[PDB]
Nucleic acid binder design. Structure first.
Ligand SMILES: [Mg+2]
Ligand SMILES: [Mg+2]
Ligand SMILES: [Mg+2]
Ligand SMILES: [Mg+2]
Ligand SMILES: [Mg+2]
Ligand SMILES: [Mg+2]
Ligand SMILES: [Mg+2]
Ligand SMILES: [Mg+2]
Ligand SMILES: [Mg+2]
Ligand SMILES: [Mg+2]
Ligand SMILES: [Mg+2]
Ligand SMILES: [Mg+2]
Ligand SMILES: [Mg+2]
Ligand SMILES: [Mg+2]
Ligand SMILES: [Mg+2]
Ligand SMILES: [Mg+2]
Ligand SMILES: [Mg+2]
Ligand SMILES: [Mg+2]
Ligand SMILES: [Mg+2]
Ligand SMILES: [Mg+2]
Ligand SMILES: [Mg+2]
Lengths: 159, 147, 48, 125, 187, 225
RNA sequence: CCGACCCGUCUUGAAACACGGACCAAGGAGUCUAACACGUGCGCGAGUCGGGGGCUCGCACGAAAGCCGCCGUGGCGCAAUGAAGGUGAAGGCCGGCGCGCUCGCCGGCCGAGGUGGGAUCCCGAGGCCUCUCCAGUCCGCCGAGGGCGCACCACCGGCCCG
């Protein structure tokens, strides 16, 4: 009974945020998108050309083709019980770079620098980041102040 | 051998391997290629594209003999003569080249797939491909036509 | 030329610890002579 | 060869008896009378066989000569052994072990000869 | 109870040849012993190839074997294939080859022998190189068969080039609707 | 030539026996050193608490790095996330046990399957009893009982673990090679709790058995194996 | 003593106030042909197949079996593509020349290109040997790296037809 319109249910998702309507900021156009980098699809409603479908809003893909105004993105879509990597054409207004990739690459650069420096100075260093370890033993100074005693409060109907 | 068949293993099973719900009925869905455009359309579209319609000119009284022109490639060309011919031509001091008549072998057109050994040869054929002719000329051979 | 330059650059040279000692002896190869020595010591008895 | 003929007759043979979840072989030179490659008395280039003598006393030990493999008339040499039990078994042991003539059939022939010798003497009352 | 799915416990693989060929079973016995009592993985590969069906043992042409032996460093090595050596009349010169194969075509065998070559059965190979040392294990084109032109994505789907099953080939046989844009669609 | 081959066999046998003796002596000394280390740890906790109490302050012990997780519910009607996690904990049958190294990832992972497990912080005696009574090794995909030290040595000797005592040291003190030592052990096939249960369907803090009983897991272990 | 509703069937659900069944014996229901498709076994293998005909004391079996080869006509395969007229599947390297102009004329070789994987195989520094060594003799094993890379997969090239 649901219609199959290309924008059904997109009343809020493609809408502009509050007091962010109007002219699209230009810095979204001077971004450089090479092939093989990671982008996040947004799909603003100000530019109706080259919009992605509602099933790609919020998904993350990899750019495989660059054109005059848009890019080609390989993005995974789940259909029933299979993941097929769809290729979509999205204009650059609706995408932005993924900061997870940038954080990973800067971690790689730091790791390589750390390896070079450690092989210089001989002493081993840790690279594989660890999950939050259990806290080690420590002392808690009272500083001559008795810890405050707490009772539960009496009940009273306030509202 | 009926003793090796699946019926001998289905004795005692009431449905005989055809299910209790849907059963085995006479012809659910039609007989033969019934409903190729209505309810078996997905199967025909998916596995037999192009099945429905007319394409091209219809020609009454086609005679298959008229267009009979079997072909032979260049790589299999030297198999039409005995190896004695090949070695005699290869070791020959003079420039004499053997003559291979493919019509005698039952082939009418000489196609150009493959490459030839570098030794001259005369090929008697009804039709020649352009690249076949070029490859025969490149090894110093010659092409002649027969009717 | 890059292979030659890099290759000529590369070739351009110039306690007791009882548990540790026991782990050294217990090695099948590093501790062969040690256990041979202790076997000879346990076998032969000599004065002084 | 022995292996090839075995693959031929391991399941299709007139001497094969398949009954009561058991298998037996009835060719003349089969000690233990079992259907097995080791004990088969036809496929091997050399075999031994212990049978009772024609008269009801002593055993006959048949062995296969190397020369006439395709010559079944003279391929088998039979010697009749009609001595006491210990001497008979010692003679069979010497025939098999000293000649190295199939040492894997030594105890088989010893046991079969013992069984035949006990079958030969009169039963108790 | 215990929480394991049991639908994949029974691995499907050839533990023995389906054939009743007594010679094949004999050399299967030989290479079973060789693979069990040696550390050579070549014996394992040969043994598991002897189990394979005929479609899994495609014939090896003479030309392909010559081409593979002619690669650098494979001089004076034994070419081993579990299958049939097949003559290729498209090749004219045959070098000296030392080949072990399950079967050799009479014409291919004649060409190999007249070229000064040697042909070994697998028992002869076992006597020669029991570990398979100095051998080049080859295989024929496994997907060189007509059935694989029909296998793949369905013919009536976009971007599929798989051969449909037709009783005859001609302009009247599955070429109109779904094959050209002039009749409905093309995909 | 019989004499020199006899001498060869005698020398090879003697060398093998001397190697065996040296390895046994190493095992003995390592167990002694582990005993010393354990009593140092146990007395150190007491001493730290005592000096903090002398100063009038509070000594917060390091929260434990090792946990023992026991699956207490069956395999019927389990949600897919819980089932997947229990498969990841190697707890695929009721009353299995597994030593789980504690960190943020493992703690959240245990929080997911909280109604289905009962876990806590084992002491040394629980570890010794577990490894010695129900210790089975996954040696070449086979549940092999740890009856000889050679079984541990062949599979884990590359990590320095060559005996029962070394394995217990890597389990109790969560060592550098804890992952290999713990995955080497088959999940423990604990029996039913003798003396019964309080209630398996509610949390421990509300009178039941599910969830984290922080040191009372040792009582369950004693009644369990 | 404990447990224990009548089977078959349709059904979400049958002991059902749902239908068939009083009892017993015998009979009683996925077959054959044709055409495909895939898998497996066998023979030969760029071939293969005599199935129709013919030749062999005409016939117990034998209406079988054997053979034909200038009986392979023919079928399937070995070449595709186009509605059709028709056309119809080999490149790489080193060169001298125009003007080595994004190409035209020849040489010499090689003989279906290349990339990433790739079972297998090959080389292999270095190790393992004994009553000990300074001294090298023959072969075995482990072995870091390296090399040729089957089939097959992904990709990029190349060739034929419209
Ligand atoms: Mg809404
Ligand atoms: Mg059933
Ligand atoms: Mg229905
Ligand atoms: Mg069970
Ligand atoms: Mg089941
Ligand atoms: Mg329940
Ligand atoms: Mg009780
Ligand atoms: Mg519940
Ligand atoms: Mg009914
Ligand atoms: Mg109803
Ligand atoms: Mg009922
Ligand atoms: Mg009722
Ligand atoms: Mg009624
Ligand atoms: Mg009814
Ligand atoms: Mg009635
Ligand atoms: Mg009735
Ligand atoms: Mg009846
Ligand atoms: Mg006939
Ligand atoms: Mg013809
Ligand atoms: Mg490759
Ligand atoms: Mg291409």
């Amino acid at each position: 009974t649901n219609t199959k319109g290309k924008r059904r249910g997109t009343r809020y998702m493609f809408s502009r945020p509050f007091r962010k309507h109007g002219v699209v900021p230009l810095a979204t156009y001077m971004r450089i998108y090479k092939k093989g980098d990671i982008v996040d699809i947004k799909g603003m409603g100000t530019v109706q050309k080259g919009m992605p479908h509602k099933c790609y809003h919020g998904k993350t893909g990899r750019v495989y083709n660059v054109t005059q105004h848009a890019v080609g993105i390989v993005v995974n879509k789940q259909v029933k019980g299979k993941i097929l990597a769809k290729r979509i054409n999205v204009r650059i207004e609706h995408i932005k770079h993924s900061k997870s990739r940038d954080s990973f690459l800067k971690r790689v650069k730091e790791n390589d620098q750390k390896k070079k420096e450690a092989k210089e100075k001989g002493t081993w260093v840790q690279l594989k980041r660890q999950p939050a370890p259990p806290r080690e033993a420590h002392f808690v100074r009272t500083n001559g102040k008795e810890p405050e005693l707490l009772e539960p409060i009496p009940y009273e109907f306030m509202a | 051998p009926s003793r090796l068949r699946k019926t001998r293993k289905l004795r005692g099973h009431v449905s005989h391997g055809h299910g209790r719900i849907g059963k085995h009925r006479k012809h659910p869905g039609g007989r033969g290629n019934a409903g190729g455009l209505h309810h078996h359309r997905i199967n025909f579209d998916k596995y037999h594209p192009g099945y429905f319609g007319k394409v091209g000119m219809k020609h009454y009284h086609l005679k298959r003999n008229q267009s009979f022109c079997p072909t032979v490639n260049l790589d299999k060309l030297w198999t039409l003569v005995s190896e004695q011919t090949r070695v005699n031509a290869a070791k020959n001091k003079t420039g004499a080249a053997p003559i291979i008549d493919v019509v005698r072998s039952g082939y009418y057109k000489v196609l150009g797939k493959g490459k030839l050994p570098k030794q001259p040869v005369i090929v008697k054929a009804k039709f020649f491909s352009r690249r076949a002719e070029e490859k025969i000329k490149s090894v110093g051979g010659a092409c002649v036509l027969v009717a | 030329k890059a292979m030659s330059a890099r290759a000529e650059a590369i070739k351009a040279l110039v306690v007791s610890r009882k548990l540790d000692r026991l782990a050294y002896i217990a090695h099948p190869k590093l501790g062969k002579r040690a256990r041979a020595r202790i076997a000879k010591g346990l076998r032969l008895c000599r004065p002084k | 060869s022995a292996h090839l003929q075995w693959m031929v007759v391991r399941n299709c043979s007139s001497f094969l008896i398949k009954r009561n979840k058991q298998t037996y072989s009835t060719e003349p030179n089969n000690l233990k009378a079992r259907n097995s490659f080791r004990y088969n008395g036809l496929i091997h280039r050399k075999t031994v066989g212990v049978e009772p003598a024609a008269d009801g006393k002593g055993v006959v030990v048949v062995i296969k000569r190397r020369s006439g493999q395709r010559k079944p008339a003279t391929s088998y040499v039979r010697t009749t052994i009609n001595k006491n039990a210990r001497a008979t078994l010692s003679s069979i042991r010497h025939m098999i072990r000293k000649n190295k003539y199939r040492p894997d059939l030594r105890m088989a022939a010893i046991r079969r000869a013992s069984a035949i010798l006990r079958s030969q003497k009169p039963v108790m009352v | 109870g215990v929480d394991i799915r049991h639908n994949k416990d029974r691995k499907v693989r050839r533990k023995e040849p389906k054939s009743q060929d007594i010679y094949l079973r004999l050399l299967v016995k030989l290479y079973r012993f060789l693979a069990r009592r040696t550390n050579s993985t070549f014996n394992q590969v040969v043994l598991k190839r002897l189990f394979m069906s005929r479609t899994n043992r495609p014939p090896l042409s003479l030309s392909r074997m010559i081409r593979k032996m002619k690669l650098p460093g494979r001089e004076n090595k034994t070419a081993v294939v579990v299958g049939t050596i097949t003559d290729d009349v498209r090749v004219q010169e045959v070098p000296k080859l030392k080949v072990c194969a399950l079967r050799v075509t009479s014409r291919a065998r004649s060409r190999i022998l007249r070229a000064g070559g040697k042909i070994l059965t697998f028992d002869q190979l076992a006597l020669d190189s029991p570990k398979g040392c100095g051998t080049v294990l080859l295989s024929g084109p496994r997907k060189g068969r007509e059935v694989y032109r029909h296998f793949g994505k369905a013919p009536g789907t976009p971007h599929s080039h798989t051969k449909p099953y037709v009783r005859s080939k001609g302009r009247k046989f599955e070429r109109a609707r779904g094959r050209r844009a002039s009749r409905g669609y093309k995909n | 030539n019989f004499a020199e081959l006899k001498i060869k066999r005698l020398r090879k046998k003697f060398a093998q026996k001397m190697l065996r003796k040296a390895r046994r002596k190493l095992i003995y000394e390592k167990a002694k050193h582990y005993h010393k280390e354990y009593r140092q740890m146990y007395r150190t906790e007491i001493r730290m608490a005592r000096m903090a109490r002398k100063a009038g302050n509070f000594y917060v012990p390091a929260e434990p790095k090792l946990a023992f997780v026991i699956r207490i519910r069956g395999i019927n009607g389990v949600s897919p996330k819980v089932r997947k996690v229990l498969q990841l904990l190697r707890l695929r049958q009721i009353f299995n046990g597994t030593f789980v190294k504690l960190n943020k990832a493992s703690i959240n992972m245990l929080r997911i399957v909280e109604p289905y497990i009962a876990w806590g912080y084992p002491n040394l005696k629980s570890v010794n009893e577990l490894i010695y009574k129900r210790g089975y090794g996954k040696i070449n995909k086979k549940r092999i009982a740890l009856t000889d030290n050679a079984l541990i040595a062949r599979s884990l000797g590359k990590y320095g673990i060559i005996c029962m005592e070394d394995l217990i040291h890597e389990i109790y003190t969560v060592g550098k090679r804890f992952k290999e030592a713990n995955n080497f052990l088959w999940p423990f096939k604990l029996s039913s709790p003798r003396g019964g249960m309080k209630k398996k369907t509610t949390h421990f803090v509300e009178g039941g058995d599910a969830g984290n009983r922080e040191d009372q897991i040792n009582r369950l272990i004693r009644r369990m194996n």
